[PDB]
Amino acid sequence: SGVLLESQTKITDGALHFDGKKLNHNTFENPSKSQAYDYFFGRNISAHGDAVKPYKHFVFMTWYKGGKEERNVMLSRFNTKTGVVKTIQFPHRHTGFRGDPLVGESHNTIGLAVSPLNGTIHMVYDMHAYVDDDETGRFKGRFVDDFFRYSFSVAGAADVPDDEFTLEQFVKDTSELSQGADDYKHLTMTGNLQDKENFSALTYPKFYTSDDGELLHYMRWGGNNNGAYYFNKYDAKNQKWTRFTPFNHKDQKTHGNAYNWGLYGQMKYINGKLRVGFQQRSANNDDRFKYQNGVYYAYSDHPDGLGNWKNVDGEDMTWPLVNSDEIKIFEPGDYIDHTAPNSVHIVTGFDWTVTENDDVHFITHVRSTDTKRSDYKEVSIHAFKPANAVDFTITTDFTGADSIYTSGDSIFIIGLKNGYPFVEKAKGGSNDFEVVYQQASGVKFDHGTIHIENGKAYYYLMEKGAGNALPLHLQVIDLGVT
Ligand SMILES: [Ca+2]
Ligand SMILES: [Ca+2]
């Protein structure tokens, strides 16, 4: 195997977690004012999203400060050599469901990146499709001049001594729209407010580092049955980003398609190209799929993703994409023989990776919408195309997972089981998964987030416990490919 725990370090005793109750449309206007922290989606907000990045001999981590009454954006640097954690406290505090800080909002992660070219640090945080609106709006004017939230540092900050690793390394908002002497939140990544609408109504900050050390970023517009992915790139020389560019048109029915669709999956810079892989949700509510259908995959030969997009068979893709049929690989719907409207349930279980070796892997899951029907069916699916194969191998001999990773010659399932990290390892282009690592004692974890770098897994975890201020740990797990 070669798989084992290289280090566990405690980052803090007190990160934010929603320990209260789940509200809904009927109760979100009356949240608990007591000790407990109520929430509208999920309880997870710390050790969640793109919140962990290695840089040289450091690991950088983002989290929200624990205490329902605290909620500060935080940035820690861990020196893996000295063992020193040095933390920067930002003024911005979690603003909650539609800007009510009494209702926890699990979408509102702190995405993190460090430029290897100039040592700048970037954070995009606390965002769920916000826009400028008024008292009559869904957001009740709470996001005016603050609907996109970007913090960034001067060149060389990632590398300064611990003493110098302070807020004073981060660039304040001194724009005409500045909210004042403590405002560290930029409304554009371009540094030109002329561009603010291009940064409007976005969610899920995610960063990548190109093979030549360029930072890429993408976020998601829309939801449900009408969405688009938008991506941009860091101009290290001019210390600014480009405007967002679409992968696909939103409102696909107005751009020539038969229906609107949403995307469920991810864009990933993997094996030297910007690529994407997802399941769509069509606005068609009379077909057999209640939610998602299909698997879709494309890649760009352009360094920045600005065109030259191809499907898996190397066929030129219409860009921005309108018709999801151009890049469809297979239909998980084929693996269940229900015909009735809304009978096929595809939501959980999807992810995808491309190995260094160009082995293309997709995991999904499909069940009957109706769990009580006599002829019920549930199946997990691994679809993979080995580097030098014609077609996909598609198997139900698979127990399912929420994520898939790759390092060196191999693919991995990494997750929690009864509170303890496990690794499953298989050769790229195979379905031969084996458990090769299982932690079996010590404090247990509630949740976390994985980043793969240097043939290791950085597992950024929140420890199990009661209340809204809980410890964060970082595990470095060698994956045995190195
Ligand atoms: Ca600002
Ligand atoms: Ca449907």
Side-chain angles (χ1 to χ4, degrees), residues 1-34 36-68 70-134 136-175 177-193 195-355 357-371 373-376 378-426 428-433 435-482:
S1 145
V3 180
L4 67 71
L5 182 64
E6 164 185 320
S7 60
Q8 185 183 292
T9 313
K10 173 135 90 161
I11 300 96
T12 187
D13 229 331
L16 192 60
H17 192 59
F18 310 135
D19 70 318
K21 9 103 201 168
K22 199 192 175 319
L23 304 186
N24 59 30
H25 113 237
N26 299 335
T27 59
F28 81 93
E29 304 201 54
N30 199 45
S32 156
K33 290 150 155 220
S34 87
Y37 203 166
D38 300 341
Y39 67 93
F40 192 79
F41 304 106
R43 317 182 159 279
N44 307 339
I45 186 80
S46 301
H48 199 36
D50 196 28
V52 61
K53 299 291 178 79
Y55 169 82
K56 294 169 177 194
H57 64 277
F58 300 109
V59 187
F60 290 80
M61 276 152 288
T62 52
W63 49 283
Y64 287 98
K65 191 213 212 175
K68 154 158 191 200
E70 308 287 77
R71 307 187 310 283
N72 300 260
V73 170
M74 319 285 282
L75 178 69
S76 302
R77 186 173 69 188
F78 170 47
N79 196 326
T80 67
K81 297 297 191 60
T82 62
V84 165
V85 177
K86 193 34 202 214
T87 298
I88 295 163
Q89 180 166 321
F90 282 77
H92 180 75
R93 291 163 66 212
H94 178 53
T95 53
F97 178 72
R98 302 181 171 182
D100 181 11
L102 294 168
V103 188
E105 161 59 280
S106 49
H107 289 80
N108 275 36
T109 63
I110 313 164
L112 167 67
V114 181
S115 179
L117 293 187
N118 67 5
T120 54
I121 298 158
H122 310 272
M123 289 152 86
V124 174
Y125 52 89
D126 205 19
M127 282 172 63
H128 192 195
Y130 299 140
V131 302
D132 290 334
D133 77 354
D134 75 330
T136 59
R138 140 150 48 199
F139 302 137
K140 313 213 207 289
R142 288 169 185 165
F143 299 104
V144 169
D145 302 344
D146 194 41
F147 52 83
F148 186 104
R149 306 166 155 174
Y150 171 52
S151 303
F152 70 95
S153 75
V154 297
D159 290 282
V160 298
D162 295 323
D163 270 26
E164 281 162 42
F165 185 83
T166 78
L167 197 50
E168 330 327 322
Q169 299 293 322
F170 283 75
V171 173
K172 278 195 224 167
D173 184 352
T174 57
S175 84
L177 299 186
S178 177
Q179 304 174 298
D182 64 337
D183 170 10
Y184 278 88
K185 294 172 280 175
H186 294 272
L187 186 57
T188 74
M189 304 186 66
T190 57
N192 183 359
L193 291 165
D195 300 314
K196 81 198 196 171
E197 284 298 305
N198 169 258
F199 286 84
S200 189
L202 291 171
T203 309
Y204 306 104
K206 184 60 201 282
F207 294 88
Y208 295 100
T209 297
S210 95
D211 288 3
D212 290 354
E214 308 273 57
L215 292 179
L216 302 169
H217 173 65
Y218 90 103
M219 299 191 74
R220 184 201 199 207
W221 180 92
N224 193 11
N225 40 37
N226 178 19
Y229 296 159
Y230 288 86
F231 52 88
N232 70 339
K233 180 197 66 78
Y234 180 56
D235 177 6
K237 196 204 85 67
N238 300 303
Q239 291 170 262
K240 59 183 64 177
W241 298 75
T242 57
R243 289 173 52 96
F244 282 118
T245 300
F247 160 73
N248 69 282
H249 283 299
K250 56 171 124 162
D251 308 303
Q252 297 93 333
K253 71 196 178 162
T254 70
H255 293 84
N257 210 46
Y259 53 83
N260 292 333
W261 40 281
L263 294 85
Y264 291 76
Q266 287 173 247
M267 301 192 93
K268 301 171 166 190
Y269 186 89
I270 310 234
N271 200 19
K273 301 189 186 165
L274 187 65
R275 311 174 185 263
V276 72
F278 66 97
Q279 302 191 291
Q280 77 171 359
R281 180 187 297 183
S282 171
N284 176 350
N285 289 332
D286 300 319
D287 68 6
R288 55 198 295 244
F289 304 105
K290 181 186 219 179
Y291 298 116
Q292 277 85 275
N293 82 280
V295 173
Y296 307 87
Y297 166 78
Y299 65 90
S300 181
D301 284 333
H302 192 288
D304 313 341
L306 302 181
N308 309 117
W309 282 87
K310 304 207 162 254
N311 69 12
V312 77
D313 296 327
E315 298 162 345
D316 288 328
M317 183 196 91
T318 303
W319 173 76
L321 188 54
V322 176
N323 193 326
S324 73
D325 283 354
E326 295 197 26
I327 65 167
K328 189 191 210 192
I329 290 178
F330 82 108
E331 181 55 77
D334 286 357
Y335 291 75
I336 197 174
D337 68 7
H338 298 334
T339 65
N342 290 297
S343 51
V344 172
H345 192 275
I346 303 154
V347 179
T348 54
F350 173 85
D351 194 13
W352 69 269
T353 191
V354 182
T355 66
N357 197 50
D358 210 49
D359 310 285
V360 180
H361 286 270
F362 300 99
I363 68 174
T364 191
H365 187 83
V366 189
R367 73 178 173 73
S368 316
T369 301
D370 184 17
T371 75
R373 69 189 293 157
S374 138
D375 52 336
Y376 176 85
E378 181 145 18
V379 93
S380 293
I381 302 167
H382 187 194
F384 56 102
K385 209 182 95 291
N388 291 296
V390 192
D391 300 315
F392 278 77
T393 299
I394 315 184
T395 203
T396 53
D397 183 9
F398 180 58
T399 56
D402 299 320
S403 285
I404 193 155
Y405 311 89
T406 186
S407 202
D409 85 297
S410 288
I411 60 188
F412 301 85
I413 298 191
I414 306 166
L416 296 171
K417 189 185 191 189
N418 305 125
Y420 288 134
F422 70 92
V423 179
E424 287 186 72
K425 190 186 183 157
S430 66
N431 189 31
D432 291 327
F433 279 107
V435 183
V436 296
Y437 177 80
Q438 180 66 84
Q439 165 170 9
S441 64
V443 299
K444 289 189 180 213
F445 307 102
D446 176 83
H447 73 253
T449 191
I450 301 172
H451 187 83
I452 305 302
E453 188 79 283
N454 310 310
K456 298 159 137 83
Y458 298 71
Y459 210 161
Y460 188 34
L461 287 150
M462 172 170 276
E463 170 184 329
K464 268 186 142 138
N468 43 59
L470 295 161
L472 297 180
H473 302 261
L474 167 75
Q475 290 193 352
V476 191
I477 298 168
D478 153 287
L479 291 181
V481 299
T482 68

